[PDB]
Amino acid sequence: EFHMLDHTGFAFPSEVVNGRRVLKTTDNNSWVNVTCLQLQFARFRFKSAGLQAMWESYCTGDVAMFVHWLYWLTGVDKGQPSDSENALNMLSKYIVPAGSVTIERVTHDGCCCSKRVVTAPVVNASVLKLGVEDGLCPHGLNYIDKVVVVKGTTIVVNVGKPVVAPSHLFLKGVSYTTFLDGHYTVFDHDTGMVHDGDVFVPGDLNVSPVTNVVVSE
Amino acid sequence: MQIFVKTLTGKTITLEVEPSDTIENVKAKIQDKEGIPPDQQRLIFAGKQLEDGRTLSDYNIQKESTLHLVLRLRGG
Ligand SMILES: [Zn+2]
């Protein structure tokens, strides 16, 4: 039972960098840092008042309880590296929906075609404007799945490996989680600068392998 | 029934499953064919990550459905 547990071990030294709460790189916690960064970039709130208080505490620099809860929800032990895209997917059902994404599933010639609106805070789709190939149609051609409409704020999580691509080919977003191999960072679109633990270093999206993006209409 | 899984190398495999098969059971089947340990598998269907303890029926996964396999990242 989470409330019974010692959180003191998860009190990672934190800072404010470009107005964002960030954790010092220690104990393989980069996954925690970029998960929490994208929650701030997306401006997400939790359905539970108890979780939302833990989140507000994290942002004001009382990080231990919300960080522990992340480890606890995801089944990760202190000092173990993990997966931000997994953590974000597991966080999704706890977050108040604040937007939607329309996914077009089509063939180049239009043999078969559809659109579906997804209204979860975290949606798994291509982070590229051109989309990804995804399964064969009854007529016998491979489907392309791409994001074609953005309402409010969603976090799009790539269906695949981290993606290296000329920056213009990515879905338009405010922030891009990048993975190098591993170690997680966040490309800030506004500044063109990179959140790497508790420092702000220059970076290039064209060579950043992107795993997820905060999209906002 | 038959469903399809898009593997890490972009090729498509076939699984023999029932609607009442758990996501753990589907992951065990991908492990048999792909060698990817269940705890390292993330399965995507209709933009959703599938949860352990739930079944294919809970997500309305019908025959000739294509799941997407994504390998777990270790970021420190
Ligand atoms: Zn077709």
From Swiss-Prot, chain B:
Site (Essential for function): 68
ADP-ribosylglycine: residues carrying this PTM: 76
Residues of the full protein shown: 1 to 76 of 156
Annotated site residue numbers, Interacts with activating enzyme: 54, 72
Species for this entry: Bos taurus
Glycyl lysine isopeptide (Gly-Lys) (interchain with K-? in acceptor proteins), cross-linked positions: 76
Disulfide bonds: none
Record PTM text: Phosphorylated at Ser-65 by PINK1 during mitophagy. Phosphorylated ubiquitin specifically binds and activates parkin (PRKN), triggering mitophagy. Phosphorylation does not affect E1-mediated E2 charging of ubiquitin but affects discharging of E2 enzymes to form polyubiquitin chains. It also affects deubiquitination by deubiquitinase enzymes such as USP30. Mono-ADP-ribosylated at the C-terminus by PARP9, a component of the PPAR9-DTX3L complex. ADP-ribosylation requires processing by E1 and E2 enzymes and prevents ubiquitin conjugation to substrates such as histones.
Localization per Swiss-Prot or TrEMBL: Cytoplasm; Nucleus
Modified residue annotations for Phosphoserine: 65
Purpose: Exists either covalently attached to another protein, or free (unanchored). When covalently bound, it is conjugated to target proteins via an isopeptide bond either as a monomer (monoubiquitin), a polymer linked via different Lys residues of the ubiquitin (polyubiquitin chains) or a linear polymer linked via the initiator Met of the ubiquitin (linear polyubiquitin chains).
Ranges for domain Ubiquitin-like: 1-76
Protein name in UniProt: Ubiquitin
Location of cross-link Glycyl lysine isopeptide (Lys-Gly) (interchain with G-Cter in ubiquitin): 6, 11, 27, 29, 33, 48, 63
